[model samples]
Target: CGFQLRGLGDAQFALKEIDVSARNAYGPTVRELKETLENSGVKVTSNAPYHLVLVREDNQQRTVSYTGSARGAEFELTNTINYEIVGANDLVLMSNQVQVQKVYVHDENNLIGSDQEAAQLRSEMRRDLIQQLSMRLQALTPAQLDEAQRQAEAKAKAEAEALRAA
Candidate 1:
């Protein structure tokens, strides 16, 4: 089954009233659902953003990959997010308490030359969260649970059928 994106916000945007915008809002969610089903055996029949919190911190690290010696530099970003996933049945499948820390090592070069690397880093961080969500959903899907049940049933049935035939 396909998934639909319903914006949890109470007020709907004027653009969303149009058919084209409505379709667009639902586009990414449907794509994500299809991808989750294909890759992870999870069918995201329904889902809405439970909560999204973006956290960032100023981090200092040794910039070793630069030209010479290790120099200390400070980098800042909205690097991590804590998100919750709830199933279509209103059951919380899993809550990702600690998300993977996203870091972009900024050296003197990139900081001075261009913001392109920083922009790329932000994009990567977003992608990381999406990957994490997909993984967590797969781990909690009914299909995966049902597969385990089928295995157990098959083994028990085999033994039972053998005993009966004997």
Candidate 2:
């Protein structure tokens, strides 16, 4: 165990239960997100009306505001998690993204410290991302999802009918 810092916690979510899926089934993002939801008093089930699927996760780090010192340089960390909340009928309701950015200094003065710092920042980013996702879920009530699902399926049906007629 190494020395680290921690802080306060706050969270929420609506639509009592949801199914979370991801291409990386055992990825930390998906795992932590599921736990966070459960911690917020939301149930995570195998089958739910709303399926929160983690579509894509992008990690980008470009040296922004470089100090020009190989031993002491600054970089930015960006983690973008693109996800979707789909309906039971196999239609997508809405696709959403929650991104987190952080600035860190990787001082090669101690390579080990630098590596540890990077890991810590990544953990923080993941926590922030999941928190943001929870907020979005809370903002979306069941009625909103139901209504969106209806319109989406309606459009799909209209297109299908047109296709069949043609």
Candidate that scores best on lDDT? 2
The Cα local distance difference test for each model comes to 0.41, 0.83
Model 1: residues >4 Å from true position, as ranges? 1-72, 76-78, 87-93, 105-114, 143-166
Cα lDDT for residue 127, model 2?
A: 96
TM-score for each of the candidates: 0.38, 0.84
Q: List the residue pairs that clash in candidate 2.
A: none
Per-residue error (Å), model 2, residue 94: 0.7
Q: Write model 1 residue lDDT over 11-63, tens digit each, in one string.
A: 22111110011122344433443454344322223232221212222222233
lDDT of predicted model 2: 0.83
